[PDB]
């Protein structure tokens, strides 16, 4: 964009990110790392670990009472 060359090109014809998206699927297939949300969504976590669901209530702030109504 600031230099001129025969080799240089816009590169708009081809998209590099195309391969990046496929990378996500690869990781997903291996399930190397998964968020909590997915875990329960997939039901990967056990019932014993499901007890953590109480974290939802804490997040809302219900556990933390407000001084003002």
What are the key terms here?
elongated; monomer; 69 residues
Instruction: Figure out the total of helices.
Output: 4
Number of domains: 1
Structural category:
mainly alpha
Total strand count, please?
Answer: 0
Q: Tell me the span between the first and last alpha carbons.
A: 59 Å
Sketch the topology as an H/E string, one letter per element: HHHH
Strand percentage lies at under 5%
What is the 3D form?
Answer: elongated
Instruction: Please give the share of residues in helix.
Output: 40-55%
Radius of gyration: 23 Å
What profile does the largest beta sheet have? none
Overview of this protein structure:
There is one protein chain. This protein is mainly alpha-helical. The chain has one domain (1-69). 46% of the residues lie in helices and 0% in strands. It is built from 4 helices and no strands. The termini are far apart. The PDB classes it as structural protein. The entry lists the keywords ComGC, Pilin, Type IV pilin, Streptococcus pneumoniae Type IV competence pilin, structural protein. The assembly is monomeric. Solution structure of ComGC from Streptococcus pneumoniae.
Topology summary:
Blueprint: H1 17-30, H2 36-42, H3 47-50, H4 54-60
In short:
This protein has 69 residues and is mainly alpha-helical. It has helices at residues 17-30, 36-42, 47-50, 54-60.
């Amino acid at each position: 964009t600031k230099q001129k060359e025969a080799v240089n090109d816009k590169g708009k014809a081809a998209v590099v990110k195309v391969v990046e998206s496929q990378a996500e699927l690869y990781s997903l297939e291996k399930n190397e790392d998964a968020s909590l949300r997915k875990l329960q969504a997939d039901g990967r976590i056990t019932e014993e670990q499901a007890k953590a669901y109480k974290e939802y209530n804490d997040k809302n702030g219900g556990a933390n009472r407000k001084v003002n109504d």
